[PDB]
Amino acid sequence: MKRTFQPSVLKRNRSHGFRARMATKNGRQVLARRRAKGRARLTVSK
Amino acid sequence: AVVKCKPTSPGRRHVVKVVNPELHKGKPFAPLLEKNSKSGGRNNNGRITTRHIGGGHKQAYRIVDFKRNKDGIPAVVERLEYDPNRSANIALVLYKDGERRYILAPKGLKAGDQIQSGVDAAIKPGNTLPMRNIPVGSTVHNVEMKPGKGGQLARSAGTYVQIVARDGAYVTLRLRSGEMRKVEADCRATLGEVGNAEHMLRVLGKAGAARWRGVRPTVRGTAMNPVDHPHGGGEGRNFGKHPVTPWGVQTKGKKTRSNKRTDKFIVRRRS
RNA sequence: AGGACCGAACCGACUAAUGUUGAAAAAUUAGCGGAUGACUUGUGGCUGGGGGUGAAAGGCCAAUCAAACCGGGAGAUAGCU
RNA sequence: GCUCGCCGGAAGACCAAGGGUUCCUGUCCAACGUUAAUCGGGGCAGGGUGAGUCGACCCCUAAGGCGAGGCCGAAAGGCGUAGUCGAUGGGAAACAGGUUAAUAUUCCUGUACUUGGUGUUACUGCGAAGGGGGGACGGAGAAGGCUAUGUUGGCCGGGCGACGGUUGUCCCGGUUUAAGCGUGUAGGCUGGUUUUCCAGGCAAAUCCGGAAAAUCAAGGCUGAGGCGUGAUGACGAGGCACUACGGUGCUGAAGCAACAAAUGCCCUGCUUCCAGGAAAAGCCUCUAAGCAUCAGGUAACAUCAAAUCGUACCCCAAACCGACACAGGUGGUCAGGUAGAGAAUACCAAGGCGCUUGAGAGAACUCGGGUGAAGGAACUAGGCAAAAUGGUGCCGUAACUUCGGGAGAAGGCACGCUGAUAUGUAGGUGAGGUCCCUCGCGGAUGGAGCUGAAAUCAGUCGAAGAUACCAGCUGGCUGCAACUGUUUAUUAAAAACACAGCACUGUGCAAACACGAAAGUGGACGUAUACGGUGUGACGCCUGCCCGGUGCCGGAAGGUUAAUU
RNA sequence: AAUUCCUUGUCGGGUAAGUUCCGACCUGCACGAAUGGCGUAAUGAUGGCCAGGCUGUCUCCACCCGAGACUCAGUGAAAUU
């Protein structure tokens, strides 16, 4: 059975990558929230 | 020519084809071709704004000259070509100076026929002149609505308009819809009728033929549940309400013209 | 020539048995339908929640859909246990 | 190590995606492995990924994204121009052999090729953010010519048989060699060459397009494969000396022909059809502004440069997606033998595996199968399930029908093996020889050799010859839907949805309509033979009466009637 | 009748026996003409019905071949309470 998660690095970076987050005001707020929480990994970049 | 396919299988029984041997059996004129990507009926927001559009065969757009402003230069028809972008056929015409262009094919235009445009052109099919010089009561097509912007009326397979009167700077025309409309007596029109009259006689014959044209299936609405359509719902086939669009407009006589900007060029709207 | 015929790949899911703390949160086995087309498939792209998409079942929208998910208003309110 | 069994259009081989050291070596067995474990994709340590030619980067663009100004919007922000990004597409070049425990078209040997920089020499009109050409494109079908590859013969080496025979028409193995360069063939496309002229290609143009003459027919382009060279080489079954029986030096014979033959190549071709089939750059040309004893351009030679990143390993799976070492899912490439129409199926080759608890016993019962006296649907909601039919050829085939069908209707007959016709026929393939020739990869004749159905006649074995796997049950009446299709991923596949066809109605283009506070976008680069909405649902015969109600479309006197005053 | 409550309507066909099926009848509870009427060849993993063939579906089960169940060694769950 085909499962929901079909990995693709290009699609992963384009959808949730660091530059994608920085491209919009709401995405930048996501980074600010994660920085405030002290996340070790800000995004899925690497 | 209208030819009925033999019923060798269900799907060909009711197929009626319109075969025109005069059409060029080769590639079109490359310099006058352009890319034409399909939209699926979706606008720049990505939302479906027109339903039942999608798929179909890939098509290349032919740059058809609807203005016909090359006055004083005879042109000879080279061949008749099939145009996927419209119901009418197009004609490749070569001017005396060496320029080639695409025009809508009139009724009786063949290869080697001579055409011209301007105020001194002869009154014969395929020629384009301002309606001021066109004799009243004649049949024309590819009619301009504002001088110099290219024809917009009577461009379909076998359409045409008739000049009924010419009072002053305006000429009254009877359109295929039956509307009596008047336009400035400076708009260019082409003599004759667009020649593909048999185009209306074709019978697709099967669902797939419509899909080739790029038409997606239409879901009625009485089978849609109330959440999706005003007609939806009911145990069985009920439909106990006045016919209506999606979004709630009547569809059975309710007039929707609310322009009011022109309101002078209409005389005998229709019917 | 064909939304033509028989039939593998491929795409489907009509019947039965098994399984039902399963090998598997829908599969296996034996049959079954389509199989040049309104076909199928890889990669990338677009449409966002009273919105999308829907050959229309209220189907589908990340194992969740008669209004997704996450956080917040929030210790909603509960004449009921 | 010897047997046995299993896969072999994979359960083999090579990749992308994804993973990220799982790769190799040594060492360890606590935990992990559904058991033990000396073993492991486990622990620990070390080692391992070598590129001008492969890929990425890079140049070019598709859908689409972003978007200087700009337009629009309470703010956030939306759209979009010039531009700039974006492969799943276009764009220069390397092959064979050898080699490591683990990498190689990357290292080594041999032999090649591509794009740039610089310098010398010779001859010269060079120049683009512009013009033109090219790149550049669909589906289906049909052969013809080929190769991959296979079979047989010949050749070379070895063998003479655990049990009757086996020096022969016998047995086993091998019989391999690339890119590049030269030749330009089967075949495809197109008439060339010179001169003059021109409202076109935003200006220009010798280029493209167009026009008018003169002269010749042979000009050019494209093109698989073959052949030659590459190659006095490499490889090569086996030997000969060391040989820790783990392997290394040296040597190493034959290395041909015929036939068959692709879904691969010629072919981005040809034929045909309608639903009419990307873009841009590289590349080839044209000139403008400009520079011309310069600069630049072309050719030859020499020299230099070609960076950077990826390269291990799994990749239909124990390493990816499924919480698992999970009967699931996962795109591309390679495609041997016998039988066969076949990539079905059976048995096999190369290669890879026996699926990480076993050992006994031979109760009920359950699961998956085999057979069955007599009967033969009496079972049951229902022939559920099972059984049965099953191939090729010939004969034969009803009602009805839209004349296509129904139809493989139904039904009947023949199928093995051996010999002969014919020491292998019809057919296919085609050597030598001869002749012709614009003397070449040519044409005609020619038939050796090879390959090879089908049929008839006769004989013959068995219970059974389409013997296995494989492989339609058939017919009669009737409801519904015309049909092929679509649907409740995960209890409903249907009479439901679509459908071609039909009708009503809206819509004159800045269209109706739709998404948007708006700009704008779709509709459509369409224009009433068009487009939207609604109902009906092939086709045939038809579709009657009613406008009081509700809606819709018109109308005009009169009544009533908002803000405002 | 995919529509008929009364109802297994009545008659005929098929069966030894037919609330189903087929053909007529018309007393249409409560068909009816594009939310179409009536026909219709072909088509259908569609509904109903009848035949030939076929059979362990059944009368009525018997035997056999394998995988479990049972015993030994190793590992070692669950719902519930």
UniProtKB/Swiss-Prot annotation, chain A:
The keyword Ribosomal protein applies. GO terms for biological process: translation. GO terms for cellular component: ribonucleoprotein complex; ribosome. One of its GO terms (molecular function) is structural constituent of ribosome. Keywords: Ribonucleoprotein, Ribosomal protein. It comes from the Bacteria. Belongs to the bacterial ribosomal protein bL34 family. This is Large ribosomal subunit protein bL34. It comes from Escherichia coli O45:K1 (strain S88 / ExPEC).
UniProtKB/Swiss-Prot annotation, chain B:
GO terms for biological process: cytoplasmic translation; negative regulation of DNA-templated DNA replication initiation; ribosomal large subunit assembly. One of the primary rRNA binding proteins. Located near the base of the L1 stalk, it is probably also mobile. Required for association of the 30S and 50S subunits to form the 70S ribosome, for tRNA binding and peptide bond formation. It has been suggested to have peptidyltransferase activity; this is highly controversial. In the E.coli 70S ribosome in the initiation state it has been modeled to make several contacts with the 16S rRNA (forming bridge B7b, PubMed:12809609); these contacts are broken in the model with bound EF-G. PANTHER family: LARGE RIBOSOMAL SUBUNIT PROTEIN UL2M (PTHR13691:SF5), RIBOSOMAL PROTEIN L2 (PTHR13691). Part of the 50S ribosomal subunit. Forms a bridge to the 30S subunit in the 70S ribosome, contacting the 16S rRNA. Interacts weakly with S6 in one of the 3.5 A resolved structures. In pull-down experiments interacts with CedA. Belongs to the universal ribosomal protein uL2 family. Residues 38-47 have a biased composition (Low complexity). The modification N6-acetyllysine is found at K241. GO terms for molecular function: RNA binding; rRNA binding; structural constituent of ribosome; transferase activity; zinc ion binding. GO terms for cellular component: cytoplasm; cytosol; cytosolic large ribosomal subunit; DnaA-L2 complex. Residues 27-52, 220-271 are annotated as: Disordered. The lineage of its organism: Bacteria, Pseudomonadati, Pseudomonadota, Gammaproteobacteria, Enterobacterales. PROSITE patterns: RIBOSOMAL_L2. Disulfide bonds: none annotated. It comes from Escherichia coli (strain K12). Gene3D superfamilies: 2.30.30.30, Nucleic acid-binding proteins, Ribosomal protein L2, domain 3. Signal peptide: none annotated. The keyword Lipid metabolism does not apply. This is Large ribosomal subunit protein uL2. The keyword ATP-binding does not apply. Keywords: Acetylation, Ribonucleoprotein, Ribosomal protein, RNA-binding, rRNA-binding.
